[PDB]
Amino acid sequence: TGGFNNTTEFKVINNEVYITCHATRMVHINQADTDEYLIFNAGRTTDTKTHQQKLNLEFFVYDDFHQQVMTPWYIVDSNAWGVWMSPKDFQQMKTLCSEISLVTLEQEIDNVTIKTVTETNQGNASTKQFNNDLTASLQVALDTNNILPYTPAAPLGETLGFVPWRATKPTQYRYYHPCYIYNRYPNIQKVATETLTWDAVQDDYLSVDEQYFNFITIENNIPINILRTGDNFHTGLYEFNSKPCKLTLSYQSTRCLGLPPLCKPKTDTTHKVTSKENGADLIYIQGQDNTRLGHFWGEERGKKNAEMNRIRPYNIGYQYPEWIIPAGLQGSYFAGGPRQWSDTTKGAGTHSQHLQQNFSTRYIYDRNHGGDNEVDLLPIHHSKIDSWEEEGWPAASGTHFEDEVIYLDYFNFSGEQELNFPHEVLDDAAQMKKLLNSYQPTVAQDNVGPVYPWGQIWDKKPHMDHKPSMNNNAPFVCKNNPPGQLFVKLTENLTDTFNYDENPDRIKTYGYFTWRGKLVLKGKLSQVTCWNPVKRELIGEPGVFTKDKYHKQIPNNKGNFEIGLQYGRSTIKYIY
Amino acid sequence: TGGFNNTTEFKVINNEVYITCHATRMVHINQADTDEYLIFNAGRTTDTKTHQQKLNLEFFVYDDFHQQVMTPWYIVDSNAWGVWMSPKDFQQMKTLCSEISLVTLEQEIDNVTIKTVTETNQGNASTKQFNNDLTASLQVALDTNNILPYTPAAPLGETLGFVPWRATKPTQYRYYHPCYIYNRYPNIQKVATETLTWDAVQDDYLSVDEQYFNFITIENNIPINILRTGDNFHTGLYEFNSKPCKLTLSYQSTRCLGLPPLCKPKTDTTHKVTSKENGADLIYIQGQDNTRLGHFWGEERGKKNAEMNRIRPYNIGYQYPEWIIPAGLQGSYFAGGPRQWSDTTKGAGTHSQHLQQNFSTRYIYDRNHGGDNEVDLLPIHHSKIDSWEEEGWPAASGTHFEDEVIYLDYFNFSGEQELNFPHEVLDDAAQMKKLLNSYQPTVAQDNVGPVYPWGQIWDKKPHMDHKPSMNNNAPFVCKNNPPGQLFVKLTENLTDTFNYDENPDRIKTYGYFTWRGKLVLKGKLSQVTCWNPVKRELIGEPGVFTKDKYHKQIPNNKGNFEIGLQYGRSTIKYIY
Amino acid sequence: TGGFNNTTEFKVINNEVYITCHATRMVHINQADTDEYLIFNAGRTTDTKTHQQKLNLEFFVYDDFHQQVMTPWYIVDSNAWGVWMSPKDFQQMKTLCSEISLVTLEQEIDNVTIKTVTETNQGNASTKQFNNDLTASLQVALDTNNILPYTPAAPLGETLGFVPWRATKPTQYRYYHPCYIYNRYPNIQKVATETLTWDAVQDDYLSVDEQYFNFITIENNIPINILRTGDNFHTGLYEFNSKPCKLTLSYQSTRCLGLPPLCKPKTDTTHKVTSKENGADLIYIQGQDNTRLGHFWGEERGKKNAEMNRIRPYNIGYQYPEWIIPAGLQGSYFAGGPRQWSDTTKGAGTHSQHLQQNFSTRYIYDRNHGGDNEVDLLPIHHSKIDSWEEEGWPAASGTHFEDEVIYLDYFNFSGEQELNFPHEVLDDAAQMKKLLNSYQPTVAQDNVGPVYPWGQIWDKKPHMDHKPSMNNNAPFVCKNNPPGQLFVKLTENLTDTFNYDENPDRIKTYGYFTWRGKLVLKGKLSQVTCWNPVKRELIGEPGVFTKDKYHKQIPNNKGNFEIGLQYGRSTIKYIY
């Protein structure tokens, strides 16, 4: 119990499943470059001026500019799926459960081991001796009240590593210092056409306001614990309050809600639905084509209605303009959009990449977060980072094809004479692609579920009058405050000569400690009602045909392997 | 207790603060011009026709047209912040509390004093004698069930006065009679270009439908109390059910949510954040520029991502087109928009007024509601009314610069070759300024908080299927029905000769009474976590430099002074 | 609890506020140059003789001469405001409380970590190895009876540092050995005019008397505790007995005590008090100018009295000659004077610096006591020390303009004929500036309150027949003996070769330990009675206009920042 445990156990009692995840890591820690708190601006870029050419797009989307408070502390951040479960474990949960819910979280720290480094230069140096420092200390701070600004580490891909038998690193704690107004290319609309004079304007604009300085330290707000060799620290028992998350996906749109029309099967010939042929024809009124007994949108033009204007209870998904970037106080940002899953739209760039598949997402990760240490084929030697394309497949229900929207003004007509397109329908659809937000209160939207390994498990809600109902990063949002962030630091180890200036003179020191945590999940046995057997794995891009993906799922002779993406919502189910 | 009490007491018990506000006013009342209920149309305006010039904008935005039920009664309306607190008191609450909540409300009426006026003409008249009428009565009606349509008096700037030692007036009770359809400039789109014939169309359009007559009187619905000299009336104890309102503002946008990038401070040179220089530079992967390990929007173009497409949990604020007026049944109206706070956008009208600062607001008020009796420098002599510009400073978090929005269609590219703007980006942004609604379920919006003195404290929610989540006028919205409206009237005092026609022959009569009320507030001690001292006052426009504002905060030799604006949300805090 | 805690909590119970201040520091300690007690004279200076020029003033005011007992021990001195509170915390207390009082003090020492230094010379030396010495000891002595002479360390600006996350140093313990008589320029009045012969006299005079030797050691008087690694030391619970200190300042003088004259406001014209015009005129008796019904000083000259000779209950402040230095046994010293706050006296050096603002004070401090590490703009490179000018603003009530005093001999006259100045009034005022002490039993004087960060919190009263009622350094004076001084020392760590001579042969040794303390304050909720909102910040010299002060309140990219001055008494209130 006082030692390494990384295991999962599945237990079913009341027809509820209980998932207990044990995780343990060896955490290697170094001392920060200073013991000071630091506050600085970083990322302001001056483009290379072309007033005779044109303004630079690359300069526009690559701003990293921000202002930052950098602290001597480090976060131990366990919030990602890859920390708590192996690939088998996540498949197990994915198969057993129809839905899951967070129950409770525990974590502790012990096995503090600190050493000092001595370097004597003999034979042109390159000699290091390592000695235990038995009185050296590790400082631990738990913020249970969430005083400090909340910084989940999964979106930057730096958390505890995903492999239980490798050592891992904490990340240094830092947070934004939103005291400023920043904008890049101000007055974009004051350049006349193209290069009439200069097409580079002012570059950026910046103003900092001392009014807004908010500078928060750990030492003032939180009590700090000091741990030597035999010491240990326990966070306590945290309880999640949050709603359950379904593990099923639906492939269903507005056209599929409710009763289908009544049809008469074709008796003469035989068809399968994959043959893409009519196997039946509709039964209309008195044999009169297009005449149905419904509830429909519009006015009667002669009483011809179809499956298209049949009134539906709800709208599934909504049309939203793709890649709009608004400008906030502190910079311009991608607004994103409703997650959708598209594939195989014939046109545009033809068959190569098709479209972005609506609002597409990439994960980019290193060796310890599930990358094979080699970049996948199609100055450093090659590259050590891997990436994955997360296309939103569980969200397929509400996907919309942005090119295909049609606008009609008068749909009905006072007579049955004819129905023709206006000659502006083509142009009017192009405008409607980029400018149309179809969201309304009849819309039902479905987010992507848990994403493995790299997805964030839980997140904090913002403190605001109008609260958002959805979250891009995480399937679980805490109603109350989230689990407290866990900060760790090496005690300053000083030489005999005290420095009165900024940076202290220190003995070179490092250590490692054991992080151990327990995460408890509650779920419900999956009940699948279909006759046919179910396929729970997204296919079309495995290593089965010449993609060599699944070959890389186990270690090689060097010990390198990579972890594949898995969606928590893998099972088909009817909504409505 | 049976007498004048206007005081506030702050009391802290459980680490909760209790704020008890006592308010008392002398209320001068007159008898209405008739004892009848009146129903009329008012405000229809015929413009001066230019068919040879152009249609008049001034005629368009200045419609006051409405239909109205005017009643003999008067409202005693205490719902504004300036009624219950002094400028010191509101600063006190603003400093002590992190949030506040409404607890309970009591109010009563006594000290009824009624007089009659006799005028004898001697020496060309101008002589008035005043006599007590000891049997005269004041009628009081409390609508506890909210039968009558709800008409908060703060938006028209007429409530009980804000100064405790001045006498004040009630306002006469009236309400809209929505039986009609009204529109001004119908068929605006049927004029061809400019003045091809006549550019003034039909002016307005009006239709009244007897179907919709709803005419409600106090006498049928509510029991009425009669008060003579020694009598007194008590409303009882009302209990608010509503959510708390935070007293903190955030200056934070989407770019500032979560972990900042890891950076390395510059060791050679020294900078302060106000110097607007880089104090550090980012650490990229393998020194390869723009390469980060993230979670990002889009497809990999060669794996260059930045702080701009970094996926964020939420969107803070949203882009909404500014100054759109839709046309409802009973007229066209300004839709408003999400409250924002802008300043210092270089461009457009240059430095003078900059923009509207997004959705700007004005208060316009008289001497008793906190105006100095003189209009501020830059047919009546001068003007006695003052105004204040409420620019939405507590809402700064979600402000957007409408000119700066960018639209990209294909952000990703199948190769790393180049990224260039399309030549339509400039035009396509102009369209997107006026037509784009970026609202979606990931948006978090923050309203302006309590506004002092002129802001409304509480308000009623509409009885509707889809209820609104935000309110422009008031920080507190009652889940159940709001406090009952308090109606007051002088009993008809008739001469000896009874009139059988419309308006009664009355003895000229007036009186005054004492209104007294108690408002209880609950709050939580403010906990500020920053190192630096906090600045709780909005500056940049005080009387400190040559604005002579704070000089006017205390009475002059005439007793005139004016009350300055104060935001309830004055303290900076991190959301998320 | 056995670890780092630096936090403050504000708690309100009985309508009393309780302020608990937690403070913790890492204290770096070195071994003193000797283990001996040392007694020496220091500071005697021989001026460069000009008998042909004139005696040197610089030589006069720069004497540091003293006799001193220097001890091997070190003081841990927490007595300053900057130790116990952050800038936010002090503002909080300043805003919440009308007055404060000291309750109790606790402090302890643990986390003793001692190391030895070994230096091997290889590659021209410059190599240090650091080893734990696990049996080495720290000696701790608490003087609970105040046997040793009391030496508060704030006036020399050396106490524990003000920043909680920086390491800090103790100061070595030393005290005056008052056995001697010292005087500089004896017989200053025996030089005839200027340089009649030699204008440098005898320089100084000195005599030491063995009669008065008082030489006190820690080892004889106090029991000493020995602490190794796991050990800890607790002082116990100390209880303050002292009177409360108000947190309000008054701006009020003798002219403002009591009833003003009755006046009649001007009805024709309008004025504000900042316009500096009469808004009313006085009502005299029977319209007879200057005739009032009073209680006045003097004899009736014809019964014309004014607001100037109106008898007042008290005198607020008193006139005292500024910069007189008396000569005591052990040297000449500045006597100081009643604290006053002056500004804007037109004359003398005109507008540049005006006067000293009466008895002015400077603080001079280093980086760890709140200095930015750079000296403020307007052989070492530049200078690392900062200074602040403390001008006595809370004491403004009793300030006097020393140039403006008038002396009359016969004020009254046996007739109404005329009142004229004597021709000597001008000269007689000049004499009265330098020689006049106006103190008397009707005087009410008000000291400066708490001063942040650098002010001393508490102090000891002298053991004397006539005790002083005021203290220049500290707002709190203990009636009983003050908290005991806490002495700390490294145990002598000796080599194998024992030295029989004066200074011992030691292993080079240093350590650090944790100092932790808890200070409890009691206060009363501030009750402000004014209508207008209150301004609690001294302005006219912030960084708001081009002074860049508040910009420096948060760390830069190097971690340097400075702490601004704050007066405990920031709120205006009427005395009397």
Residue numbers in the entry:
A (entry chain G), B (entry chain A), C (entry chain F): 42 to 419, 450 to 647
Question: What does the report in the manuscript say about this coordinate set?
Answer:
Aleutian mink disease virus (AMDV), a pathogen in minks, and human parvovirus 4 (PARV4), infecting humans, are parvoviruses belonging to the genera Amdoparvovirus and Tetraparvovirus, respectively. Despite low amino acid sequence identities (10–30%) both viruses share the icosahedral nature of parvovirus capsids, with 60 viral proteins (VPs) assembling the capsid via two-, three-, and five-fold symmetry VP-related interactions, but display major structural variabilities in the surface loops when the capsid structures are superposed onto other parvoviruses. The viral capsids are critical components of the viral infectious life cycle: they protect the viral genome, are the determinants of the tissue type and host that is targeted (tropism), and remain intact while the virus escapes the endo-/lysosomal pathway and trafficks to the nucleus where the genome is released, leading to viral genome replication. The VP monomers of PARV4 and AMDV conserve the β-barrel core motif (βB–βI) with the additional βA strand and the α-helix A (αA) observed in other parvoviruses.
The reconstructed capsid of AMDV, the first determined structure of the genus Amdoparvovirus, also displayed familiar surface features with channels at the icosahedral five-fold axes, protrusions near the three-fold axes, and depressions at the two-fold axes and surrounding the five-fold axes. Unlike PARV4, the three-fold protrusions were separated and radiated further outwards (the maximum capsid diameter of AMDV being ~300 Å compared to ~270 Å for PARV4). The amino acids, including their side chains in the VP monomers, were generally very well-ordered to the C-terminal tyrosine 647, with the exception of the apexes of the loops at the three-fold protrusion, involving aa 93–94 and 238–239, which showed only weak density at a sigma (σ) threshold of ~1, preventing reliable placement of the amino acid side chains. However, due to the cleavage of the AMDV VPs at D420, no density was observed for aa 420 to 449, but both ends of VR-VII, leucine 419 and proline 450, were visible at the capsid surface. However, in contrast to PARV4, the elongated VR-I and VR-III (15 and 18 aa longer, respectively) are responsible for the three-fold protrusions in AMDV. The region at the three-fold symmetry axis between the protrusions is primarily formed by VR-VIII, while VR-V is not surface-exposed. The VR-VIII loop possesses an additional α-helix B. In fact, three helices from three symmetry-related VPs are positioned around the three-fold symmetry axis, creating a small pore with a diameter of ~3.5 Å. In fact, AMDV has the longest loop for VR-I, VR-III, VR-IV, and VR-VII among natural Parvovirinae isolates for which structures have been determined.
